[PDB]
Amino acid sequence: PNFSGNWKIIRSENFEELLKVLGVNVMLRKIAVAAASKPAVEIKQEGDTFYIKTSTTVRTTEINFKVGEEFEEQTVDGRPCKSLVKWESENKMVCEQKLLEGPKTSWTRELTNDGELILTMTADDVVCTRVYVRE
């Protein structure tokens, strides 16, 4: 599927809990949660090549990767990692992360038949789920 476009958040579940179990300081956690409530998301996909920009004033993540080639990013709680994206199924990509020790973290993105984008972010047993619609 083509994920390209600007995406707008409509649901977030377990974001604060994810940060909480990862030990993020409560003062920083409240700033992170509030910033994450209204991110600006831009995706440009050309085959297996992805540009994914998620912007908030206090944290912008900008990754330009090819599916099946390793790249550097940060975990959700800000620790440097090596990431590797693969297609799990036809409409779902799964990213495995390894720290540059800690919780086992990952993220997934998929598109529904209606064109809603579902992001999950995991740390051990805690799963955060965020749903977006294309502008």
Ligand X SMILES: CC(C)N1C=CC(C)(C)c2cc(C#Cc3ccc(C(=O)O)cc3)ccc21
Q: Does 130 bind ligand X (CB under 6 A)?
A: yes
- 81 neighbors 97 (Cβ within 8 angstroms): yes
CA-to-CA dists, residue 54 to 72, 113, 125, angstroms: 16, 23, 24
Site mask for ligand X (CB under 6 A), range 46-75, x = bound:
--------x-x-xx----------------
Structure tokens at 135: 């502008």
Residues 6 or more apart whose Cβ sits within 8 Å of residue 59: 32, 35
Phi and psi for 68 in degrees, rounded to 5?
A: 85, 10
CB of 107 to ligand X, least distance (A): 8
Site mask for ligand X (CB under 6 A), range 2-21, x = bound:
-----------------x--
Task: Rule CB under 6 A: choose which of 32, 81, 117, 123 binds ligand X.
Answer: 32
58 marked as part of a ligand binding site: no
Residue sitting closest to ligand X (CB): 78
Residues 6 or more apart whose Cβ sits within 8 Å of residue 40: 6, 53, 54, 55, 56
Binding positions are 130-132
- Residues forming contacts to ligand X in the complex (CB under 6 A) are 19, 24, 28, 31-32, 35-36, 39, 54, 56, 58-59, 76-78, 119, 130
